[PDB]
Amino acid sequence: GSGVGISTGGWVGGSYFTDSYVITKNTRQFLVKIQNNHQYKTELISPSTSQGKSQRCVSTPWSYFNFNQYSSHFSPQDWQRLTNEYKRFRPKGMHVKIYNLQIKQILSNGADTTYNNDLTAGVHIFCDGEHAYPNATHPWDEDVMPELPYQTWYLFQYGYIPVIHELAEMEDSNAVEKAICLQIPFFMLENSDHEVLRTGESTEFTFNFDCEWINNERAYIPPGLMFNPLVPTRRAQYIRRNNNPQTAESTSRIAPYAKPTSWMTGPGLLSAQRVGPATSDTGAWMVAVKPENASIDTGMSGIGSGFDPPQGSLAPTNLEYKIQWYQTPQGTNNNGNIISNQPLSMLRDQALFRGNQTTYNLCSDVWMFPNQIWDRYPITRENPIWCKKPRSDKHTTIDPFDGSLAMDHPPGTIFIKMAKIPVPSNNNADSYLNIYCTGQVSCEIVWEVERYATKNWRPERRHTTFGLGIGGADNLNPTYHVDKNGTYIQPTTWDMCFPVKTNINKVL
């Protein structure tokens, strides 16, 4: 059948797990709220603390689906079934279905509320196959899908930064900031066509990934530690005159153990320190722009973006480089707040010393160098799956230090809006009918997956629940589980979330 009163599609989920691939299926309940009236504005965000960056941005009536995270697509068991049982995996494809839509027509008699349901109403649904438009999705952000099904999924408003607020602020003069103010592009999702849906209708979307593997594997030794220490080496060490304390120059054969190596450590930036008060964008490395004239307020600050984490690789000094996240919107300064940790993988730590003719002294920087090896960030269940690689003429190796992934075309963000229904007036307008939509997204994605075999004699390592710990309310219930009170207990610190790359082994 078809029409109102006939559901379009059913609920879906439960994953799969075949040796060659893993099919994860998920379904949600969402609602679209009519953000920002239906008009756009700009909003010039800022806190005040007027010294802040005060990015101008743009607001839109649209809301969007963010599917990017692992904890959305994998249950704590599905994750840890692949983290234990497979070398590597990458998402092969993605299939999304909007269906079972509802338009409920908010009413207010004062106080209270009433919902009359509705028919003869519509919902705009738009997808990016070209990745035109500023593509809201940023790897970390918030939201994505609730890691836990049955939990309704509130969409978030779509917005974008047209241009840096400073540089076009603009200060008196200028014509250097007059341009870059004149050139700010203005994007609208109306433009390119898109589907409207009443209740009985649904929509599907597919995606394919040109995508790099993410490897769950562990190097038990540094790459420079690979050699037979029993066998002597043919090589020699000349050592300069020490010039205090003592021990004039001599040449000698390199010991059989501790043979020299190629294979430099991976790059990192360790020298900087985060600058100034919070909410001011303290990154310790600001990329900025600095056009030749322009004009600039206090800052630095205040222009450009903080680079985080430096690192990458190159084991950090203190917590300041160690990433962090709250895994919860209610998270206060210290609460939630699980902090990244070392995988104990040997790749992946990578100091560098140089110096002194007397002592070794850990060195800041370590830029790119020909023989370098590093290991991509071990990630974890809480991480974003992908990140969009911005289109540009030239680029280097492209390894994001957030883990995640880089793709020319990631999954196109699916945008959805409430289809303004106006109402007559004398003035006339601006007035509209207050409605919201509700429905079910099913994100079914296929994962290219590869299973591990090794010649190691020893048991290696897995992810037990014993890394997990008890929490919530009265302490009862362990970790991934409901409260009484039921509130899903969040995993506390890093090992709870079970990172890949801490298990198996690989001969380098």
| Residues in 126-165 that interact with its own copies by CB under 8 A | 149-150, 152, 154
Two tokens, residue 422 = 């106006």
What is the smallest separation between the CB atom of 469 and its own copies, expressed in angstroms? 8
508 near its own copies, judged by CB under 8 A: no
297 binds its own copies (CB under 8 A): no
Cβ closest to its own copies, residue 174 vs residue 282: 174
| Of the candidate residues 371, 476, 493, 507, the single one contacting its own copies (CB under 8 A) | 476
432 near its own copies (CB under 8 A): yes
Count interface residues toward its own copies (CB under 8 A). Answer: 107
- The residue within the footprint of its own copies, chosen from 21, 93, 157, 196 (CB under 8 A), is 196
* 486 lies in the binding site for its own copies (CB under 8 A): yes
**CB distance 167 to 183 below 8 Å:** no
For 392, half-sphere exposure in the C-beta direction (CA atoms, 13 angstrom radius) is 7
Report d(CA 84, CA 463) in Å as an integer: 7
178-203 burial: b if 16+ Cβ within 10 Å, else e: eebbeeeeeeebeeeeeeebbbbbbb
**Residue 507 and residue 226: Cα distance in Å, rounded?**
9
316's tokens: 């950090």
CB atoms within 10 A of CB 97: 20
The DSSP-derived string for 367-414 is ---TT-B-------TTS-S-EE----S-------TTSS-EESS-PPPE
> Is 71 near its own copies (CB under 8 A)?
no
Task: State the nearest-atom distance from the C-beta of 102 to its own copies, in Å.
Answer: 5
Q: Closest distance between its own copies and the C-beta of residue 296, in Å?
A: 17
Q: Binding to its own copies by residue 33, rule CB under 8 A?
A: yes
List binders of its own copies among 319-338 (CB under 8 A).
Answer: none
Beta strands in 56-85 (DSSP E): 59-65
HEC readout, 263-318: CCECCCCCCCCCCCCCCCCCCCCECCCCCCCCCCCCCCCCCCCECCCCCCCCCCCC
Q: Is 194 in the site for its own copies (CB under 8 A)?
A: yes
By beta-carbon proximity to its own copies, the closer residue of 229 and 422 is 422
Rule CB under 8 A: choose which of 365, 484, 493, 507 binds its own copies.
484
CB 327 within 8 A of CB 362: no
Q: Exposed/middle/buried for 392, CB within 10 Å: 0-12, 13-18, 19+?
A: exposed
Q: Tell me: does residue 122 bind its own copies (CB under 8 A).
A: yes
Q: Which residue has the tokens 């420079």?
A: 224
Distance CA(27)–CA(44), nearest Å, equals: 36
Please select the residue that binds its own copies; options are 18, 172, 186, 247, rule is CB under 8 A. Answer: 186
Least gap, CB of 358 to its own copies (angstroms): 49
| Closest CB 365 distance from its own copies, rounded Å | 39
* Stretch of residues binding its own copies (CB under 8 A), selected from 32-40, 250-258, 344-352, 360-368: 32-40
The answer to the question of residue 254 lying near its own copies (CB under 8 A) is: no
410 binds its own copies (CB under 8 A): no
Among the candidate windows 261-269, 342-350, 373-381, 470-478, which touches its own copies by CB under 8 A?
470-478
| Residue of the chain from 22, 53, 56, 303 that contacts its own copies (CB under 8 A) | 56
The residue range among 114-122, 299-307, 310-318, 346-354 that interacts with its own copies, by the rule CB under 8 A, is 114-122
H or E stretch at 78: helix 78-85
Report the run of H or E that residue 159 belongs to, with start and end.
Answer: strand 156-159
Which residue number, 35 or 311, has a Cβ lying nearer to its own copies? 35
